Design a protein around this ligand. Structure first.
Ligand SMILES: Nc1nc2c(c(=O)[nH]1)N[C@H]1C(S)=C(S)[C@@H](COP(=O)(O)OP(=O)(O)OC[C@H]3O[C@@H](n4cnc5c(=O)[nH]c(N)nc54)[C@H](O)[C@@H]3O)O[C@H]1N2
Ligand SMILES: Nc1nc2c(c(=O)[nH]1)N[C@H]1C(S)=C(S)[C@@H](COP(=O)(O)OP(=O)(O)OC[C@H]3O[C@@H](n4cnc5c(=O)[nH]c(N)nc54)[C@H](O)[C@@H]3O)O[C@H]1N2
Ligand code: SF4
Ligand code: SF4
Ligand code: SF4
Ligand code: SF4
Ligand SMILES: [S]
Ligand SMILES: [W+6]
Lengths: 214, 964
């Protein structure tokens, strides 16, 4: 199986990943407006599989702690979205044996979309108001099967985004956590045993986003 | 197989946005015979390794964009609509407007009776966005037509760097390169927001941190850069020289300078003449009438042979080093902390971290861009950085340098090709009216009598002659010299620059303007004035990707098309990935890129547009005659084309240069037609041509070195990441400039673990040595007259040492360092109705005026509207909530924006009073998108200064009010 390691201690919020995801799949842009934040789109949607969340936290001295969170499906080892949906119809949500990708299919139009979102501990699935299909991050599974990095990983300039075989990436996450703690002592890995997208947070994960961790 | 990329042809390209120079891979349908289907990063490129920021990553949406121009448009006087027209009509009628204006305006001799052979009724803006071969051909077209008002982007962001660093080191360029940042032990980012504005640079900055480096950001605002640095130090607007002067004092007081480096490789030991002095904020030789210095008062004491005297013991009181100590003793931590608003504790931390790189085996680098230098002392800011780097021995070494970050993908190149009013290609000055002959021109170059001083600029006659042979190969250089226009020696140089072109335009003194690859209706300070001023043109040519606020100024806000008589031609050019050519990145890497998809609809490359346009002028002159036809008719354009179109390859070969006959040079035989292998083999006797001497070496008989994609490195090359077989950098593939300073006088590196060059058994190993010669036999700064890195720099208008002169006018009345408040060699109103300091800056997702990126849905998606960033303090004072609509106003204009209330902005304490800063992006404009907002340059002033000619876009007075 494959895995992402996302070292949020290196993120510049360039939003290369957000754009590259849409370029590869030729996704449409949403209608957005500025409501007092650089964050946009404000949320994941049927047409937005990844958005970078921005959070400002006061600190003592000059400046802030500026927290950035490029959100995506965690590609859970034991996916609750699939456990749901398999109630209505098997084949709506499948798991790739080789990569470990969790994949939504066209049959998601036939299941209870709203229910499948609720089952997700990370609040990831989004519904098309018209066709009722569910969408989310698909791990760029076709790229991965063809020996390419996922679009968001390849584009990333800082080394925030990492991808590879699960043992290499777990070994990398443990090694990096130790190094990162020398600068950020309260650094933690997010649900490292449950998921295939392992975020390193510089502090309390919920500071980055309320569903940062399960 | 991936279906999306199956059946598509794969070509390489280079990003069309910033000067990092990231590599792309382009997939084009029908095995190259259709449209682009995908654009992403080139995994093999050594700078980005496949990475792209959102601008680069969205180039597919830029190129395959249905809002792009499809064909020429024409707008008749007083009309209120565009009329589509053929290329034939457009280029024909433009050639006639050029000829009609030239014939009526041309002046062979000025009033004083000197030959000038020019027209002053036409001006040109642009552009750093064109390929290097296009920039070169464009400048030579404009000058063959007799123009002198030739400017582009470089005036604003590049032009301060060139004399600051030239004075200091002998060249104006960024000293190191992007990959080299990874070798630094301490990175000081000051006057730069590199994480947002040069994003792939942070790949290498963070790798420096991984190996133990300290990252420091010094900025008035907390940015996405600041978020990833070890130390964020706030600084008050315009307080940079106090900051840097305190660091110089700290270095001297604590003896953290690199003693051997300073003694041997800087001008520390040189004896300054007794006529030098400084008192109460004024140097000696001040003329209070003319607001100017007599700089001969700053001259060195010369020995019997005309060489500046030296005390290697550094004990003589008039040694540069002793005068330096004296000058900066006023910059104590207490005074500096008060004015900068940086706490003493943080100053000490920053000074300690950075001055530690004064160790021989530690390296510190400074990264700056345009942010901090938009005023009259910007040159002296950069001088201070250079001086610090020289004291610490950081110039010439891996992980060191002054990394003056270039803005646009080819601003280095566009400047290199002389698209500013004062320079020809290769930084040969444009002659003034008193340089009556070529011999007089060549007479101005200073000579050295020091045998250890290479003084390379003595070769200038070879370069000027070779240039003239490139344009006019059937003429003797001395004769060809008379074809090209000359500026008036009487006038101040700034009369020919950006800001004054707008001033003259407003007085109705221009007939025609080229707006070639620029959007001045948004990019020029004081937009309301410029928009009105453009209505006093007779014709306007806009060459551009899309319709924009410049092309269509005549139907802009408040404008009545029926009252505006300007005739406008819009010519749609093609995007970067639809053409072949080179771009020179910030580190001087000259990188070749290839055509992927064919031009969209009936768009053309700039090379074809300009060449076709010139040919029509050439035809008109051949059949009608007219004003002094010779410069046009004799210009060598046959070297510029192949198979009936502009040829990037052939122009590049001409720019490199070739022998016009069998020639012996430097004890080598050369046959006629051979490519010149380096600028060392150029001649002044007509044997050689070369369009740009800097390019000599880039395209030899061995082929196009700019197109090399070879990652082969020796161990010592790979350790610091020189990549010498990847593309080509001027000069002659020297990746790190001044590298002779990186070794002792036996040729042993100061830091063996990060060697740049090394003397290994008879030769230099590593980088290409910057100046030939055995160890210990040459001074290391070969482009300097005297050979030394200049701590003391007496060629600068403001004085030989940087000194704090307040660039903020309105909130300040006293200078704590002297009795001289403002720059004494340089009319702000300060109307009390505008109490806040407005500033403009960039975000990661948009480009320049936003002309390009406001057309890309994914970038608008992330940043859809103009905003105004303010502190919680100012929000409370004005009763503004996060996300409210606010009105920002000044003496010059007004606009609306969305408020962003953030702790990332804080008040400044200036002379006991809280002063609030107000931040705007300058990426917006009325044409597109819906509800985006208009340019922040509605608010900015256009009163520059007679030295720089730069408007103040970083500190200008505004008010902010809530709207409902
Ligand atoms: N995303 C993006 N990148 C770009 C561009 C773009 O439009 N968008 N444009 C490119 C071009 S053409 C250029 S010239 C470069 C310019 O690149 P930068 O110079 O980095 O650009 P800015 O954001 O205008 O200014 C940089 C910083 O200077 C700070 N600053 C303002 N006043 C002062 C001062 O008095 N002192 C100090 N120390 N800092 C101060 C601002 O707060 C800001 O954070 O960027 C290039 N790269
Ligand atoms: N208030 C304020 N004003 C500023 C600045 C600031 O910081 N604040 N920054 C200043 C600086 S440093 C700069 S660089 C200027 C920039 O000002 P401009 O250069 O006028 O800005 P844009 O036109 O947005 O720059 C991109 C242009 O490149 C064109 N282009 C792209 N590719 C090609 C091509 O192949 N051929 C041709 N012919 N055109 C092409 C696009 O059509 C577009 O017009 O703005 C300056 N003005
Ligand atoms: S591309 Fe990398 S650095 Fe940029 S926002 Fe995404 S994860 Fe962060
Ligand atoms: S994060 Fe949610 S949508 Fe993604 S696999 Fe897990 S349960 Fe399913
Ligand atoms: S892995 Fe692919 S689908 Fe998932 S966020 Fe990244 S680019 Fe988008
Ligand atoms: S804009 Fe600059 S950093 Fe971003 S992809 Fe292009 S060259 Fe690289
Ligand atoms: S630029
Ligand atoms: W610029």
């Amino acid at each position: 199986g494959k895995m992402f390691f996302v070292d949020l201690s290196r993120c510049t919020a360039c939003r290369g990943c957000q754009i590259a995801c849409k370029q590869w799949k030729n996704l449409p842009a949403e209608e957005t407006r500025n409501t007092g934040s650089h964050q946009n789109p404000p949320d994941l949607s049927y047409v937005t599989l990844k958005t970078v969340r921005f959070t400002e936290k006061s600190r003592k001295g000059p400046g802030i702690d500026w927290l950035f969170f490029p959100e995506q499906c965690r590609h859970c080892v034991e996916p609750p979205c699939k456990g749901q949906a398999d109630v209505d119809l098997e084949g709506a949500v499948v798991k790739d044996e080789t990569t470990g990708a969790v994949l939504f299919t066209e049959l998601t139009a036939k299941v209870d979309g709203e229910s499948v979102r609720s089952a997700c501990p990370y609040d990831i699935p989004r519904i098309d108001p018209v066709t009722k299909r569910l969408s989310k991050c698909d791990m760029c599974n076709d790229r991965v099967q063809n020996g390419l990095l996922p679009a968001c990983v390849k584009t990333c300039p800082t080394g925030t985004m990492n991808f590879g075989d699960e043992q290499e990436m777990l070994a990398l996450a443990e090694k990096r956590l130790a190094e990162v703690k020398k600068t950020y002592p309260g650094a933690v890995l997010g649900d490292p045993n449950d998921v295939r997208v392992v975020y390193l947070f510089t502090r309390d994960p919920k500071d980055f986003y309320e569903h940062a961790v399960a | 197989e991936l279906q999306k990329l199956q059946w598509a042809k794969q070509t390489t390209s280079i990003c069309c946005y910033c000067a990092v120079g990231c590599g792309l891979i382009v997939h084009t349908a029908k095995d190259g015979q259709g449209r682009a289907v995908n654009v992403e990063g080139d995994p093999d490129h050594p700078i980005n390794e496949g990475s792209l920021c959102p601008k680069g990553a969205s180039i597919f949406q830029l190129g395959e964009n249905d809002q792009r121009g499809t064909q020429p448009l024409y707008r008749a006087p007083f009309s209120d609509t565009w009329k589509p027209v053929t290329w034939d009509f457009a280029l024909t009628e433009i050639a006639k407007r050029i000829k009609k204006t030239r014939d009526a305006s041309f002046t062979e001799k000025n009033a004083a009776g000197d030959l000038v052979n020019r027209t002053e009724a036409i001006a040109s803006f642009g552009s750093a966005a064109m390929d290097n071969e296009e920039c070169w051909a464009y400048g030579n077209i404009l000058r063959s037509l007799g123009l002198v008002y030739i400017e582009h982007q470089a005036r604003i962001x590049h032009s301060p760097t060139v004399p600051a660093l030239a004075e200091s080191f002998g060249r104006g360029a960024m000293t190191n390169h992007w990959n080299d940042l990874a070798n630094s032990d301490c990175i000081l980012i000051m006057g730069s927001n590199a994480a947002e504005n040069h994003p792939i640079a942070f790949k290498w900055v963070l790798r420096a941190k991984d190996k133990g480096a300290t990252l420091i950001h010094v900025d008035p605002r907390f940015t996405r850069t600041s978020a990833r640095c070890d130390v964020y130090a706030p600084i008050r607007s315009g307080a940079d020289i106090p900051f840097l002067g305190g660091l110089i004092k700290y270095i001297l007081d604590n003896k953290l300078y690199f003693t051997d480096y300073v003694r041997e490789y800087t001008n520390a030991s040189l004896i300054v003449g007794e006529k030098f002095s400084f008192k109460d904020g004024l140097f000696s030789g001040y003329d209070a009438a003319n607001k100017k210095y007599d700089k001969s008062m700053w001259a060195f004491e010369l020995d019997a042979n005309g060489v500046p005297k030296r005390d290697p013991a550094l004990k003589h009181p008039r040694c540069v080093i002793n005068l330096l100590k004296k000058h900066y003793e006023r910059y104590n931590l207490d005074k500096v902390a008060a004015i900068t608003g940086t706490s003493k504790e943080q100053l000490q931390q920053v000074y300690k971290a950075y001055a530690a790189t004064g160790k021989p085996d530690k390296a510190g680098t400074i990264m700056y861009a345009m942010g901090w230098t938009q005023h009259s002392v910007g040159v002296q800011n950069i001088r201070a950085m250079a001086m610090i780097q020289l004291l610490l021995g950081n110039i010439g070494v891996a992980g060191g340098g002054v990394n003056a970050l270039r803005g646009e993908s080819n601003v280095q190149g566009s400047t290199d090709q002389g698209l500013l009013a004062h320079i020809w290609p290769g930084y040969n000055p444009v002659p003034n009216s008193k340089a009556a002959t070529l011999e007089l021109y060549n007479a101005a170059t200073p000579q050295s009598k020091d045998p250890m001083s290479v003084n390379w600029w003595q070769n200038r006659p070879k370069y000027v002659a070779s240039y003239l042979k490139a344009l006019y190969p059937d003429e003797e250089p001395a004769a060809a010299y008379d074809y090209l226009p000359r500026i008036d020696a009487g006038r101040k140089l700034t009369d020919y620059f950006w800001l004054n072109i707008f001033e003259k335009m407003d007085k109705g003194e221009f007939k025609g303007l080229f707006a070639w690859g620029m959007n001045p209706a948004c990019g020029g300070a004081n937009a309301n004035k410029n928009r009105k001023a453009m209505g006093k043109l007779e014709w306007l040519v806009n060459v551009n990707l899309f319709e924009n606020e410049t092309s269509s100024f005549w139907k802009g806000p408040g404008m009545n098309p029926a009252e505006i008589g300007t005739e406008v031609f819009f010519l749609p050019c093609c995007v970067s990935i639809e053409k072949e050519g080179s771009v020179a990145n910030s580190g001087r890497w000259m990188q070749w890129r290839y055509r992927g998809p064919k031009p969209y609809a009936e768009t053309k490359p700039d090379g074809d547009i300009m060449l076709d346009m010139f040919k029509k002028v050439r035809e008109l002159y051949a059949k009608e005659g007219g004003a002094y036809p010779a410069p046009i008719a004799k210009l060598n354009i046959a070297d510029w084309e192949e198979h009936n179109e502009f040829s990037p390859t052939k122009v590049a070969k001409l720019m490199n240069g070739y022998f016009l006959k069998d020639t012996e040079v430097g004890g080598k035989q050369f046959k006629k037609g051979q490519q010149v292998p380096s600028f060392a083999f150029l001649t002044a006797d007509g044997s050689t041509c070369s369009g740009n001497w800097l390019h000599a070496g880039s395209f030899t008989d061995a082929g196009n070195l700019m197109a090399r994609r070879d990652k082969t490195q020796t161990p010592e090359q790979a350790r610091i990441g020189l990549f010498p077989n990847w593309s080509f950098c001027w000069p002659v593939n020297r990746r790190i400039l001044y590298n002779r300073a990186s070794v002792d006088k036996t040729g042993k590196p100061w830091n063996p673990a990060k060697a740049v060059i090394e003397w290994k058994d008879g030769k230099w190993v590593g980088d290409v040595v910057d100046g030939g010669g055995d160890p210990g036999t040459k001074h290391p700064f070969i482009m300097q007259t005297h050979g030394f890195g200049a701590l003391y720099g007496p060629g600068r208008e403001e004085g030989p040492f940087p000194e704090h002169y307040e660039p903020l006018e309105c909130p300040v009345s006293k200078n704590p360092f002297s009795k001289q408040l403002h720059n004494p060699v340089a009319k702000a109103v300060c109307d009390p109705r505008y109490p806040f300091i407005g500033t403009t800056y960039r975000v990661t997702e948009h480009w320049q005026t936003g002309l390009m990126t406001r057309r890309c849905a994914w970038l608008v998606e992330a940043e859809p509207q103009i905003f105004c960033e303010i502190s919680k303090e100012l929000a409370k004072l004005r009763g503004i909530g996060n996300g409210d609509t606010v009105k920002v106003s000044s003496l010059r204009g007004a606009l609306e924006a969305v408020a962003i209330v953030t702790e990332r902005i804080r008040p400044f304490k200036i002379e006991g009073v809280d002063v609030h800063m107000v931040g705007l992006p300058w990426h917006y404009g009325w044409m597109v998108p819906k509800n985006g907002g208009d340019t922040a340059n509605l608010l900015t002033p256009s009163a520059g200064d007679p030295n720089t000619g730069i408007p103040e876009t970083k500190a200008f007075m505004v008010d902010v009010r809530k709207v409902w």
